[PDB]
Design a protein around this ligand. Structure first.
Ligand SMILES: O=S(=O)(NCc1ccco1)c1ccccc1F
Lengths: 254, 300
């Protein structure tokens, strides 16, 4: 059924699964026209399709040309996402096809189910988890490839860099969700934390800096404090009063 | 005017004939129903006074044979049977009529209700939904499941309604996923009308039969079929004008006839709200929308 807190370890078992997030597929800037009406201008988007076990990211770039002369774009964006996910599954060898696809937004269930009728053994699932995959466009290298695309393009990333050499996919996924949650709540501060030591660089073939296990623990701390700081600034709450049980619950709760 | 004689009424029972019903007492000298209008299918139905789970009946057409009811004390129900001997049957009916032991099918002359509910329903189509080829009449009850319900357990006792499934390969052409899912016109017009039903009359006949089984037996799978067939039309942008006008008439008489008190179990909130207020055909069912709004405004 629905993916939640109760069945979270299932993400890291040996059944191939993909998360699909469609938040960044249809992206617009809203502006005034000369006559003082409002209009949108579409920018390049992307489907965020992630194997939470391996870190393999299938970033399908959605070029603005997709939308030309189309109506009801927010509805079309769901169906185009479902088409591209189904085309990706079909492109994978049988033993690489997912057994489950978890959609981050329930409006994707019918579009994806209808595009995947050829795959009746692939379970299409919602999640109760509030996942911060919208913040994918706050990862510089991902934003750059989307913005520069002049045509439809698929780009393959490992969103965990080389972390699985040292940690489990459970820990890699928690690290990724905490990073994305921070970037989503305060991008400026999140990035400042990630670059605060210019000696720790991002390798050409990586998205994140080359932190030691010790530096990752410190960074993870600073990210939690940022999420807490921002939750404090948001709700007008004295955070210095909070307990560790109170605290844990608002990154969880978030 | 045709007659369905009863051998006897050994158990207390509510007997239905089409939209009419009357209570018969244990061993009441009831010998059946006369003046049944020729030209239409009919349904005789039963609800035992001692056990309301026992809810069942027979679709028949008096043009196809001489039918009577006889209680079977072993299977514990009123069974329909065909009398082959024309002269025996005529003599049975004549006696019971002379002794006035028959209720008269109580049709008001102004009243087109039964015609309006059964306009497209034909015994030959019923006999394909309800498979029992040795009889010319068809048994239905409250618990019989549909072929579709049995896919998601006894095939011989099933209602073989046409399977409609909006999220099936049948409903959705490869490469027209969004178009076919949001506008069911292809599924309605090519797959169902041209392909399976051959014409709108057969489609309406199954729709009407599904409603009637839902209303007279509280058959849940029939209710599901009636709603699917309404939704498939209302969710199609392209429907012949004659079908829309006829659908409005069909549905109006169904809503008109539904017992006020059964609205809650027999009407699907989501389908009706969608069909009357959201769908392509939201403005095409004036009669139906007016009777629903005036009779069942809570549901909406
Ligand atoms: O946004 S990134 O592409 N990745 C995440 C990030 C932010 C800071 C460190 O890592 C990036 C930003 C700034 C400098 C190098 C980079 F790799």
């Amino acid at each position: 059924g629905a993916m939640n807190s109760s069945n979270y370890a299932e993400l890291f078992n040996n059944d191939i699964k993909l998360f699909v997030d469609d938040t960044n597929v249809y992206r617009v800037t809203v502006h005034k026209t000369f006559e003082g009406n409002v209009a949108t201008k579409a920018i390049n988007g992307c489907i965020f399709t992630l194997n939470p076990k391996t870190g393999h990211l299938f970033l399908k770039i959605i070029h603005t040309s997709v939308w030309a002369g189309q109506k009801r774009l927010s509805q079309l964006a769901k169906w185009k996402t479902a088409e591209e996910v189904s085309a990706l599954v079909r492109s994978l060898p049988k033993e690489e096809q997912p057994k489950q696809i978890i959609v981050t937004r329930k409006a994707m269930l019918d579009p994806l189910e209808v595009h995947m009728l050829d795959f009746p053994n692939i379970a299409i699932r919602p999640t109760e988890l509030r996942l911060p995959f919208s913040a994918a466009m706050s990862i510089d290298k991902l934003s750059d490839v989307v913005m520069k695309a002049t045509e439809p393009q698929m780009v393959l990333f490992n969103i965990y860099d080389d972390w699985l050499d040292r940690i489990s996919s459970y820990t890699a996924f928690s690290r990724l969700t905490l990073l994305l949650r921070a970037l989503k709540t305060n991008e400026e501060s999140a990035k400042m934390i990630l670059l605060s030591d210019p000696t720790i660089t991002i390798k050409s073939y990586h998205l994140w800096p080359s932190f030691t296990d010790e530096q990752w623990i410190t960074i993870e701390s600073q990210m939690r404090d940022l999420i807490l700081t921002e939750y404090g600034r948001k709700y007008n709450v004295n955070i210095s009063a909070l307990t560790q049980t109170e605290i844990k619950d608002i990154i969880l709760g978030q | 005017m045709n007659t369905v004689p009863f051998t006897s009424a050994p158990i207390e029972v509510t007997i239905g004939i089409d939209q009419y019903s009357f209570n018969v007492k244990e061993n009441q000298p009831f010998h059946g129903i006369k003046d049944i209008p020729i030209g239409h299918v009919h349904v005789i139905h039963f609800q035992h006074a001692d056990n309301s789970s026992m809810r069942y009946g027979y679709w028949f057409d008096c043009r196809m044979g001489n039918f009577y009811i006889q209680y079977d004390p072993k299977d514990g129900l009123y069974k329909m049977m065909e009398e082959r001997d024309g002269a025996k049957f005529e003599n049975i009916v004549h006696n019971f009529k002379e002794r006035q032991m028959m209720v008269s099918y109580p049709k008001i002359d102004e009243d087109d209700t039964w015609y309006n509910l059964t306009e497209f329903v034909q015994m030959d189509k019923i006999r394909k939904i309800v498979r029992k080829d040795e009889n010319q009449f068809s048994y239905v009850d409250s618990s019989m499941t549909t072929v579709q319900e049995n896919e998601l357990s006894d095939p011989a006792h099933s209602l073989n309604y046409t399977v409609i499934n909006f999220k099936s390969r049948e409903a959705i052409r490869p490469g027209h996923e969004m178009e076919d899912f949001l506008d069911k016109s292809y599924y309605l017009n090519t797959v169902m009308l041209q392909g399976i039903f051959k014409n709108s009359s057969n489609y309406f006949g199954e729709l009407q039969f599904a409603f009637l089984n839902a209303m007279f037996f509280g058959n849940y799978g029939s209710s599901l079929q009636w709603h699917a067939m309404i939704e498939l039309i209302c969710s199609s942008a392209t429907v012949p004008k004659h079908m829309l006008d006829k659908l409005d008439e069909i549905l109006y008489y169904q809503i008109k006839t539904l017992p006020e008190q059964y609205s809650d179990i027999l009407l699907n909130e989501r389908v009706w709200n969608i069909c009357l207020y959201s769908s392509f055909q939201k403005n095409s069912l004036h009669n139906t929308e007016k009777i629903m709004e005036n009779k069942y405004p809570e549901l909406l």
